[PDB]
Amino acid sequence: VSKESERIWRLQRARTILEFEKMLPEWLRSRFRMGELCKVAEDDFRLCLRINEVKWTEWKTHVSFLNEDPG
């Protein structure tokens, strides 16, 4: 139950978040609507969500980009 607690809390929170998001008026949802447009290719322009993660157990090297300039 140590972990089962986290399981049940996560499930209840997800269901609560989704039903609350359903309760809002459409204009409020359009106001919140996380995710920003991003050009990915010639004409792709998809709604992307930026996720800055820190994996402090890293041993590798990264060389790729879309906007190499750190945001």
* Binding interface with its own copies (CB under 8 A): 54, 56-57, 59, 61, 63-65, 68-70
Question: CB 2 → its own copies: shortest distance, Å?
Answer: 12
Query: For residues 45 and 39, is the Cβ–Cβ distance under 8 A?
Result: yes
Q: Which is nearer to its own copies, 3 or 33 (CB)?
A: 3
The per-residue DSSP string of 12-36 comes to HHHHHHHHHHHHS-HHHHHHH---E
Question: CB 7 → its own copies: shortest distance, Å?
Answer: 19
Question: CB 24 → its own copies: shortest distance, Å?
Answer: 31
The Cα–Cα gap between 54 and 43 comes to: 31
Q: Which is nearer to its own copies, 30 or 64 (CB)?
A: 64
